[PDB]
Design an enzyme around this catalytic site. Structure first.
Site, PDB file in Angstrom:
ATOM      1  N   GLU A  91       0.906  -1.170   0.000  1.00 10.47           N
ATOM      2  CA  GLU A  91       0.000   0.000   0.000  1.00 10.47           C
ATOM      3  C   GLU A  91       0.938   1.211   0.000  1.00 10.47           C
ATOM      4  O   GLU A  91       1.869   1.197   0.781  1.00 10.47           O
ATOM      5  CB  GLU A  91      -0.802   0.003   1.289  1.00 10.47           C
TER       6      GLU A  91
ATOM      7  N   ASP B 113      11.472  -6.195 -12.504  1.00  8.53           N
ATOM      8  CA  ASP B 113      10.094  -5.711 -12.589  1.00  8.53           C
ATOM      9  C   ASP B 113      10.105  -4.373 -13.307  1.00  8.53           C
ATOM     10  O   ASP B 113       9.358  -3.443 -12.935  1.00  8.53           O
ATOM     11  CB  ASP B 113       9.443  -5.613 -11.205  1.00  8.53           C
TER      12      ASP B 113
HETATM   13  N1  LIG Z   1       8.479   7.747  -5.281  1.00  6.82           N
HETATM   14  C1  LIG Z   1       7.232   7.698  -5.724  1.00  6.82           C
HETATM   15  N2  LIG Z   1       6.675   8.820  -6.219  1.00  6.82           N
HETATM   16  C2  LIG Z   1       5.423   8.766  -6.675  1.00  6.82           C
HETATM   17  N3  LIG Z   1       4.595   7.732  -6.736  1.00  6.82           N
HETATM   18  C3  LIG Z   1       5.187   6.636  -6.257  1.00  6.82           C
HETATM   19  C4  LIG Z   1       6.457   6.530  -5.749  1.00  6.82           C
HETATM   20  N4  LIG Z   1       6.705   5.228  -5.351  1.00  6.82           N
HETATM   21  C5  LIG Z   1       5.602   4.591  -5.648  1.00  6.82           C
HETATM   22  N5  LIG Z   1       4.646   5.393  -6.172  1.00  6.82           N
HETATM   23  C6  LIG Z   1       3.342   5.006  -6.661  1.00  6.82           C
HETATM   24  O1  LIG Z   1       2.978   3.815  -6.008  1.00  6.82           O
HETATM   25  C7  LIG Z   1       2.597   2.809  -6.969  1.00  6.82           C
HETATM   26  C8  LIG Z   1       2.884   1.449  -6.396  1.00  6.82           C
HETATM   27  O2  LIG Z   1       4.249   1.440  -5.971  1.00  6.82           O
HETATM   28  P1  LIG Z   1       5.091   0.100  -5.903  1.00  6.82           P
HETATM   29  O3  LIG Z   1       6.282   0.321  -5.058  1.00  6.82           O
HETATM   30  O4  LIG Z   1       5.289  -0.422  -7.270  1.00  6.82           O
HETATM   31  O5  LIG Z   1       4.114  -0.910  -5.164  1.00  6.82           O
HETATM   32  P2  LIG Z   1       4.043  -2.491  -5.127  1.00  6.82           P
HETATM   33  O6  LIG Z   1       3.173  -2.904  -3.989  1.00  6.82           O
HETATM   34  O7  LIG Z   1       5.417  -3.068  -5.181  1.00  6.82           O
HETATM   35  N6  LIG Z   1       3.269  -2.749  -6.509  1.00  6.82           N
HETATM   36  P3  LIG Z   1       3.673  -3.784  -7.680  1.00  6.82           P
HETATM   37  O8  LIG Z   1       4.602  -3.025  -8.559  1.00  6.82           O
HETATM   38  O9  LIG Z   1       2.473  -4.194  -8.432  1.00  6.82           O
HETATM   39  O10 LIG Z   1       4.407  -4.943  -7.147  1.00  6.82           O
HETATM   40  C9  LIG Z   1       3.414   3.174  -8.206  1.00  6.82           C
HETATM   41  O11 LIG Z   1       2.852   2.600  -9.377  1.00  6.82           O
HETATM   42  C10 LIG Z   1       3.434   4.704  -8.157  1.00  6.82           C
HETATM   43  O12 LIG Z   1       2.368   5.277  -8.875  1.00  6.82           O
HETATM   44 MG   LIG Z   2       6.840  -4.998  -5.597  1.00  6.10          MG
END
Ligand SMILES: Nc1ncnc2c1ncn2[C@@H]1O[C@H](COP(=O)(O)OP(=O)(O)NP(=O)(O)O)[C@@H](O)[C@H]1O
Ligand SMILES: [Mg+2]
Length: 330
Positions: free
Chosen positions: A47, A151
């Protein structure tokens, strides 16, 4: 079975201290110094929220991790600490956790991002050469530090277009490259999975990231999202086969001694190479160039060993406008 063409010895040269993320002691920051404002993202294991570092009253991102295993959390922190100060890698501000449930979070810098579906169509031919080249810089850096993102995709490439800045995020699937290690093939997103993932070849390396870079790039220049639109992991190989052909699939399997799973003979079929020029249309013609196609073709190869390295891609003629502008600007 397979050893990477470049940077294979990096983990051996850097120490155990560099890659032994199991034995990592995390100096947790103070959870209560951060206030969560609004939810901006979510993931299978996370999240994400825009937040405020209260002592400085400054914007940041807090990612609340759901642990698959404690060891996976150490890997992500270890990798972010190692890649600190590297071009176009998201900056690590803090790691914190709730005192009672021990759920961790990672604090990174905030990036003012536009959704890629909204942002990619607004780009010029130069913007694509510039933003892909900026992404290469990250990929090259973290590959040169013995790390594979695994990824690479639009969703993990934040771009601030007014600032013209790019950051690669989501290092939760990142792992250290150790020569000959069987890695898990259940990594990346469906549409950016490499052929090796799809055939359960386990001895892959930093070239996995370049195939995905090529899916991404092909999506931008052909104005088709995603480029390879398989409905499941089996269909995903079929969609790749309809473009690349199955003549080169079979010699690649033969070359790497991979026997394909029996499910495929029923759906794989026989396909001829579809030339890159058939994807050109009136809508996506702005992106199209003979350098862009050549560059794409040296990314999207069944054999990971035939793919361009991040360092090699930077010297490609497609980026020469980007290089020229940067030299003249300074
Ligand atoms: N530094 C940041 N600045 C702005 N938005 C961010 C940033 N980091 C993450 N987000 C937003 O958060 C979303 C999800 O982040 P993420 O770290 O990829 O989550 P996750 O739970 O690992 N998702 P997934 O990629 O499906 O495994 C991204 O697609 C961005 O839109
Ligand atoms: Mg991830």
């Amino acid at each position: 079975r397979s050893v990477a063409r470049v940077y294979a010895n990096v983990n051996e040269k850097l120490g155990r201290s560099w890659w032994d993320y199991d034995n990592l002691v995390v100096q947790w920051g103070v959870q209560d110094n951060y206030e969560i404002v609004r939810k901006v993202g979510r993931g299978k294991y996370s999240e994400v929220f825009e937040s405020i570092h209260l002592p400085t009253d400054s914007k940041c991102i807090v990612k609340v991790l759901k642990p698959v295993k404690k060891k996976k959390i150490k890997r992500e922190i270890k990798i972010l600490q190692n890649l600190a100060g590297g071009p176009n890698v998201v900056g690590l501000l803090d790691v914190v956790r709730d005192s009672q449930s021990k759920t961790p979070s990672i604090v990174t810098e905030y990036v003012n991002n536009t959704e890629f579906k909204t942002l990619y169509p607004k780009f010029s031919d130069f913007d694509v050469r510039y933003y892909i080249f900026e992404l290469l810089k990250a990929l090259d850096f973290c590959h040169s530090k013995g790390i594979m993102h695994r990824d690479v995709k639009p969703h993990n490439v934040m771009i601030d277009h007014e600032k013209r800045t790019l950051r690669l995020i989501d290092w939760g699937l990142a792992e250290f490259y150790h020569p000959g290690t069987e890695y898990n093939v259940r990594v990346a997103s469906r549409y950016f999975k490499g052929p090796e993932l799809l055939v359960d070849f386990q001895e892959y390396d930093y070239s996995l990231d370049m195939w995905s870079l090529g899916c991404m790039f092909a999506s931008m220049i052909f104005r088709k999202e995603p480029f390879f639109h398989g409905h499941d992991n089996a269909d995903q190989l079929v969609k790749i086969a309809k473009v690349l052909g199955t003549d080169e699939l079979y010699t690649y399997l033969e070359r790497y001694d991979i026997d394909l799973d029996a499910q495929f003979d029923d759906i794989l079929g026989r396909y001829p190479r579809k030339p890159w020029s058939r994807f050109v249309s009136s809508e996506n013609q702005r992106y199209i160039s003979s350098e862009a196609i050549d560059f794409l073709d040296k990314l999207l190869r069944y054999d990971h060993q035939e793919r361009l390295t991040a360092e090699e891609a930077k010297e490609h003629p497609y980026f020469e406008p980007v290089r020229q502008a940067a030299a003249q600007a300074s």
